[PDB]
Design an enzyme around this catalytic site. Structure first.
Site, PDB file in Angstrom:
ATOM      1  N   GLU A 269      -6.285   7.967   2.207  1.00  0.00           N
ATOM      2  CA  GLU A 269      -7.206   9.071   2.219  1.00  0.00           C
ATOM      3  C   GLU A 269      -8.605   8.517   2.028  1.00  0.00           C
ATOM      4  OE1 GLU A 269      -5.991  12.987   0.161  1.00  0.00           O
ATOM      5  OE2 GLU A 269      -7.850  12.398  -0.869  1.00  0.00           O
TER       6      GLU A 269
ATOM      7  N   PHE B 161     -14.045  11.427   3.991  1.00  0.00           N
ATOM      8  CA  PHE B 161     -14.185  12.458   5.028  1.00  0.00           C
ATOM      9  C   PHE B 161     -12.868  13.055   5.515  1.00  0.00           C
ATOM     10  CE2 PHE B 161     -18.774  11.997   5.794  1.00  0.00           C
ATOM     11  CZ  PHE B 161     -19.027  10.784   5.220  1.00  0.00           C
TER      12      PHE B 161
ATOM     13  N   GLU C 175      -9.558  -1.550  13.900  1.00  0.00           N
ATOM     14  CA  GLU C 175      -8.461  -2.485  14.070  1.00  0.00           C
ATOM     15  C   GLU C 175      -7.476  -2.331  12.881  1.00  0.00           C
ATOM     16  OE1 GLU C 175     -10.064  -6.309  13.235  1.00  0.00           O
ATOM     17  OE2 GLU C 175      -8.121  -7.340  13.395  1.00  0.00           O
TER      18      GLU C 175
ATOM     19  N   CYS D  42      -4.646  -3.620  10.174  1.00  0.00           N
ATOM     20  CA  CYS D  42      -4.186  -4.823   9.495  1.00  0.00           C
ATOM     21  C   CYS D  42      -2.803  -4.405   9.164  1.00  0.00           C
ATOM     22  CB  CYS D  42      -5.010  -5.086   8.241  1.00  0.00           C
ATOM     23  SG  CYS D  42      -6.602  -5.858   8.586  1.00  0.00           S
TER      24      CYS D  42
ATOM     25  N   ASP E  56     -19.116  -4.031  -3.344  1.00  0.00           N
ATOM     26  CA  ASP E  56     -17.782  -3.638  -3.793  1.00  0.00           C
ATOM     27  C   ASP E  56     -16.687  -4.636  -3.410  1.00  0.00           C
ATOM     28  OD1 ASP E  56     -16.225  -1.921  -5.356  1.00  0.00           O
ATOM     29  OD2 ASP E  56     -15.653  -0.650  -3.654  1.00  0.00           O
TER      30      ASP E  56
ATOM     31  N   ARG F  44      -8.825  -4.698  -3.919  1.00  0.00           N
ATOM     32  CA  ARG F  44      -8.549  -3.332  -3.476  1.00  0.00           C
ATOM     33  C   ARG F  44      -9.122  -3.058  -2.053  1.00  0.00           C
ATOM     34  NH1 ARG F  44     -11.785  -2.305  -7.666  1.00  0.00           N
ATOM     35  NH2 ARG F  44     -14.018  -2.130  -7.186  1.00  0.00           N
ATOM     36  N   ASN F  45     -10.165  -3.789  -1.669  1.00  0.00           N
ATOM     37  CA  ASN F  45     -10.800  -3.613  -0.381  1.00  0.00           C
ATOM     38  C   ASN F  45     -10.482  -4.719   0.605  1.00  0.00           C
ATOM     39  OD1 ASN F  45     -11.981  -1.145  -1.241  1.00  0.00           O
ATOM     40  ND2 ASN F  45     -13.631  -2.283  -2.197  1.00  0.00           N
TER      41      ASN F  45
ATOM     42  N   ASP G 256     -12.553  -1.629   5.814  1.00  0.00           N
ATOM     43  CA  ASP G 256     -13.680  -0.790   6.247  1.00  0.00           C
ATOM     44  C   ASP G 256     -14.692  -0.574   5.117  1.00  0.00           C
ATOM     45  OD1 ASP G 256     -14.968   1.117   8.237  1.00  0.00           O
ATOM     46  OD2 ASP G 256     -14.569   2.415   6.513  1.00  0.00           O
TER      47      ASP G 256
HETATM   48  C1  LIG Z   1      -7.995  -0.052   1.216  1.00  0.00           C
HETATM   49  N1  LIG Z   1      -8.685   0.521   2.387  1.00  0.00           N
HETATM   50  C2  LIG Z   1      -8.517   1.930   2.637  1.00  0.00           C
HETATM   51  C3  LIG Z   1      -9.173   2.859   1.828  1.00  0.00           C
HETATM   52  C4  LIG Z   1      -8.993   4.220   2.047  1.00  0.00           C
HETATM   53  C5  LIG Z   1      -8.172   4.657   3.062  1.00  0.00           C
HETATM   54  C6  LIG Z   1      -7.508   3.740   3.861  1.00  0.00           C
HETATM   55  C7  LIG Z   1      -7.669   2.367   3.666  1.00  0.00           C
HETATM   56  C8  LIG Z   1      -6.935   1.379   4.543  1.00  0.00           C
HETATM   57  N2  LIG Z   1      -7.591   1.070   5.808  1.00  0.00           N
HETATM   58  C9  LIG Z   1      -7.041   0.270   6.743  1.00  0.00           C
HETATM   59  N3  LIG Z   1      -5.773  -0.114   6.570  1.00  0.00           N
HETATM   60  C10 LIG Z   1      -5.280  -1.010   7.424  1.00  0.00           C
HETATM   61  N4  LIG Z   1      -3.956  -1.288   7.276  1.00  0.00           N
HETATM   62  C11 LIG Z   1      -2.960  -0.711   6.468  1.00  0.00           C
HETATM   63  C12 LIG Z   1      -1.661  -0.670   6.977  1.00  0.00           C
HETATM   64  C13 LIG Z   1      -0.634  -0.086   6.252  1.00  0.00           C
HETATM   65  C14 LIG Z   1      -0.931   0.466   5.012  1.00  0.00           C
HETATM   66  C15 LIG Z   1      -2.221   0.434   4.493  1.00  0.00           C
HETATM   67  C16 LIG Z   1      -3.235  -0.171   5.217  1.00  0.00           C
HETATM   68  C17 LIG Z   1      -2.216   1.164   3.183  1.00  0.00           C
HETATM   69  C18 LIG Z   1      -0.762   1.552   3.010  1.00  0.00           C
HETATM   70  O1  LIG Z   1      -0.261   2.121   2.042  1.00  0.00           O
HETATM   71  N5  LIG Z   1      -0.086   1.119   4.109  1.00  0.00           N
HETATM   72  N6  LIG Z   1      -5.930  -1.565   8.457  1.00  0.00           N
HETATM   73  C19 LIG Z   1      -7.180  -1.143   8.647  1.00  0.00           C
HETATM   74  C20 LIG Z   1      -7.814  -0.220   7.832  1.00  0.00           C
HETATM   75  C21 LIG Z   1      -9.238   0.186   8.096  1.00  0.00           C
HETATM   76  F1  LIG Z   1      -9.751  -0.348   9.242  1.00  0.00           F
HETATM   77  F2  LIG Z   1      -9.401   1.508   8.130  1.00  0.00           F
HETATM   78  F3  LIG Z   1     -10.031  -0.189   7.154  1.00  0.00           F
HETATM   79  S1  LIG Z   1      -9.968  -0.299   3.042  1.00  0.00           S
HETATM   80  C22 LIG Z   1     -11.348  -0.055   1.989  1.00  0.00           C
HETATM   81  O2  LIG Z   1     -10.255   0.314   4.298  1.00  0.00           O
HETATM   82  O3  LIG Z   1      -9.640  -1.689   3.009  1.00  0.00           O
END
Ligand SMILES: CN(c1ccccc1/C=N/c1nc(Nc2ccc3c(c2)CC(=O)N3)ncc1C(F)(F)F)S(C)(=O)=O
Length: 260
Positions: free
Chosen positions: A16, A19, A86, A88, A132, A136-137, A150
């Site tokens: 989540e 936005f 993209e 991950c 940050d 976690r990121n 992101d």
């Molecule tokens: C921690 N991050 C998030 C924060 C808030 C909402 C979403 C995110 C994850 N984003 C992303 N996640 C992945 N892969 C992923 C695959 C499976 C799972 C997860 C992540 C989590 C989970 O349980 N299974 N790839 C790309 C992104 C994006 F480009 F959007 F950043 S962050 C700050 O973008 O790195």
């Protein structure tokens, strides 16, 4: 950069955001193989202010081209507004480390720290301050590849246990305060996703740091690597190394581990 919504197969929700929900999915690229993507959705992008703020997060990522920073694939500007990033595949770094624990050799943990230093040295070259840097990121593309997630999706771009003294005291954020955070991130990697100062109240952290106290040497951490972390945690920001220096030392530390 514009993507057509019919070229997206929306999958499972993976988090989540501020936005709206973030989903895993597939982008059916024209004349190319389909890509695994992360979809940032927006619930209230009917308002022009919300939409402009949301689309600004895509413009931020658009200006970066690095193998260890998630790429912007494109955007869907029709309602509901989506940002295509993209994927991950293996998810969040903290969860990956907690599951794989000591089954990850030291050479891999050092490789992750090195890869993050190349992305942070790239951000530094473009005069961009993250604010940050924390495990976690960080996301996992494969067993031998990590990436900065992101920037919009990062909650603090108050994490007192990761922040440099000048950020806690004066809200000053520079590339030198990013280096302090990166040292804490390196500690988290070597601690297999354990949080810094666990069971310590945020107000007492400041007192400990001023008194010269630092995060302990993680078990099985090479002393050269712990020494590099302690350089990131120099109280005076001007005595901390730059990311290009951390990148060079981490490369040497990684080569030495591979040798034995
Ligand atoms: C921690 N991050 C998030 C924060 C808030 C909402 C979403 C995110 C994850 N984003 C992303 N996640 C992945 N892969 C992923 C695959 C499976 C799972 C997860 C992540 C989590 C989970 O349980 N299974 N790839 C790309 C992104 C994006 F480009 F959007 F950043 S962050 C700050 O973008 O790195």
């Amino acid at each position: 950069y514009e993507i057509q919504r019919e070229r997206i197969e929306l999958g499972r929700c993976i988090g989540e955001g501020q936005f709206g929900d973030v989903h895993q999915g597939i982008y059916m690229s024209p004349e190319n193989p389909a890509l695994a993507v992360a979809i940032k959705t927006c619930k209230n992008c009917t308002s022009d202010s919300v939409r402009e703020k949301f689309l600004q997060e895509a413009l931020t990522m658009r200006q970066f081209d690095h193998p260890h920073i998630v790429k912007l694939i494109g955007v869907i500007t029709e309602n509901p507004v989506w940002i295509i990033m993209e994927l991950c595949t293996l998810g969040e770094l903290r969860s990956f480390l907690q599951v794989r624990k000591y089954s990850l050799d030291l050479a891999s943990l050092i490789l992750y720290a090195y890869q993050l230093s190349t992305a942070l040295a790239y951000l530094e070259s473009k005069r961009f301050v993250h604010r940050d840097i924390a495990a976690r990121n960080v996301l996992v593309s494969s067993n031998d590849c990590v990436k900065l997630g992101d920037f919009g999706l990062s909650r603090y771009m108050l994490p007192i246990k990761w922040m440099a003294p000048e950020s806690i005291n004066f809200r000053r954020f520079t590339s030198a305060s990013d280096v302090w955070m990166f040292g804490v991130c390196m500690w988290e990697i070597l601690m297999h996703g354990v949080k810094p100062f666990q069971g310590v109240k945020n107000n007492d952290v400041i007192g400990r740091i001023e008194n010269g106290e630092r995060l302990p040497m993680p078990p099985n951490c090479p002393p050269t690597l712990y020494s590099l972390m302690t350089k990131c945690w120099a109280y005076d920001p001007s005595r901390r190394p730059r990311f290009t220096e951390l990148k060079a030392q981490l490369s040497t530390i990684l080569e030495e581990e591979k040798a034995q």
